[PDB]
Amino acid sequence: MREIVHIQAGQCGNQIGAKFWEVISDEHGIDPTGSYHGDSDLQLERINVYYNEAAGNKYVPRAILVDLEPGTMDSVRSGPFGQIFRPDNFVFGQSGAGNNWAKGHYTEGAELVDSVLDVVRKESESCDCLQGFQLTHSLGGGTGSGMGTLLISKIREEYPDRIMNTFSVVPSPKVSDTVVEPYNATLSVHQLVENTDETYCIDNEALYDICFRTLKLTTPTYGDLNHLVSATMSGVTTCLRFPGQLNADLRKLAVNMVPFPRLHFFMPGFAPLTSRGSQQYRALTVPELTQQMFDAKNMMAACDPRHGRYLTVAAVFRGRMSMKEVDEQMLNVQNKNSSYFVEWIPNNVKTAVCDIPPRGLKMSATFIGNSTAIQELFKRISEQFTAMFRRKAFLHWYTGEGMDEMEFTEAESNMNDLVSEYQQYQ
């Protein structure tokens, strides 16, 4: 039961997603030929959650690859795990998106979306029991932002009772990567607030910081950054695919992390995070892992958590460990740093546990924080957007596709309301 439909939209989303699949395939003992070569029955028990089986023990991701240009997907295909995907699951155009939400959402994306939806429908029909949908995008481009938003809207209309979660790569205010970034992000978020149950917010700045400080990486590759994201993603759904002492459903996580409908933007984190060299100075305790997880240097969103408070935190631990030990340690953390934990919620954290480590570790953990601090990120984007709008800069590219000032204003109002809500529950 509880099978998940995977969608990658736009370049970022697609490349991250490739790595995600690679990771998970390795985890479940699936080789690039789609054959299983694992050593445990636990490895196949719940393989249904991500994969479909075909004749000759072939396994196929229930994955959809979407793009408005071919190059990215061609590269994916050429790649190592690219040949595992069912070829009819590549849905793509040829006309470019110009980092333009309007092209993705209104015009070129509108032309392709129905074909995507049909494939989605088939996958849904092939499910014993559909749990939900996982999307990968950027916030700042045209495809992931415009097309991605579009797709989510249509899927929620069709499956309004199912879980909708996104791993969304967001702008980092100190190092912008595109000129229209604020426009694309604000337009996207305006619709993500309404049409997703959870969004995991990653900013590349934070990843770079992680790479430099802890992993001792002078030269991060996008591949390595994607690996980090992939690990988080895998961690999130471990308890759907494996046993445990205390188990976590996706829906249960949402319930534990969402006190109000709108506040579902999470900062993910991971542990352990060290170099090949700074590991022998450490032992692997639950305490150690928790310390790592609550270290600002191990956050993947662009905030100091101390510039705010955690409303709710979910930790998912993997490996054999004492529940007593874990709970006690978390209680100690709560006691000693009580000011960073909103007082409305007794037992500020949720813990989940999986009786199964990821290959080559004894223990691991993945962290999901919902903090009032993340308002700062929203503020920065709103300010950036606002200045450009004040001068109607770059606007002709969007007005030419039918978009109107009022819509833009609405988006800004939404953003401001979001931040106000965070302020209220500071």
């Binding site: 370049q11 110009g98 702008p171 595109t178 000129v179 229209v180 790479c211 950036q384 450009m388 002709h396």
Partner: protein
Amino acid sequence: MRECISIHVGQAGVQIGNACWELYCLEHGIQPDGQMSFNTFFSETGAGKHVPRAVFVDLEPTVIDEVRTGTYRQLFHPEQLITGKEDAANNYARGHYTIGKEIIDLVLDRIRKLADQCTGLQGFLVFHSFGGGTGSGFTSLLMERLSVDYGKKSKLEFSIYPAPQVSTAVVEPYNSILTTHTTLEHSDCAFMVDNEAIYDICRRNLDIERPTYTNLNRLISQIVSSITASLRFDGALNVDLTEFQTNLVPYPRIHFPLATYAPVISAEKAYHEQLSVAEITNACFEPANQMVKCDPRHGKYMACCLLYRGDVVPKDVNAAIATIKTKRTIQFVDWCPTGFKVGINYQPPTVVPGGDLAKVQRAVCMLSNTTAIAEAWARLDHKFDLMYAKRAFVHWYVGEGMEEGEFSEAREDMAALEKDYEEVGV
């Protein structure tokens, strides 16, 4: 796939195009014959040959006659190479009105035919000169025709600007202004250099004592290649022609990028030098290394795009950008904080044997719109006024269908543009 069309018009443009084509051939592995995303610039035959997705026009036969006897000859298919009878005679009014309205139709038909090969016709490339007779009016006419036909499609102009001090023609000032009058309301993006700057660069960075056209053209070709390679090749953070339009056109009228390419380093000076990413970025932002007579300190960069090539790391680039931002001298516009697009390609630039440049693992092309360029425009206007006051060299133009008020209108337009720039700066 995403695929392109090349147009080289006027002597200068044709010359540039030769070099460009040579570069392309060297890069993708194509011979002088055609023997061996390569299809953006090369359509395949039945076998063996590949045909440059190109068009070559000049009213002087002697230019294209040269092409027809050179080594690069049977690469081209004689359908493309068009010739006139009597040349443009450094006279817009022959290029647009008289001899223009005769052979333009043929060229249009050829273009249409070429398009009917492109599934994904991304757009065009036009190479000309604000300074030739052919390149000033004929080019404009062609642009107009293209607009009438397609409109939505992507259009670029590589425009050789009049060097403020150094004259070539006697009526360079009129021609340029006339071109501006007509091209401005069609071509969404124009990438511009002047020769003086290139000469300076050759003198200083390359230690070349003899400024000549071939080496200069090669530099431009390199820039062109850098601009393209996002379509022509793989890489994280890729780029589309439409993305440039979106990114570097804040208001629809202001669309005149400068260009620059670093490293510009000889055989010796490559050694006694590391060539780091940050260093390269710094070099790109240097006052002297710009490819036009325009001090970037005398204004503000509105929107900037940087197209890194070869062995590059994103984090390093980000760091470099941060450093640049930190520098208080290099001013940006108040209202656009996010004024960078990052482009990264795993293909490193490859230099033509018997030329200026040496091997460099990493390079950048930087494309920027500024309030500082307005000075050049002002200078041009002043020049125009000075010689329009006498009304000298006007008896060439009047004879081939012209009016006195047109000039005035053009001047008014220029003034308006200047005003707009000033407003932007404010």
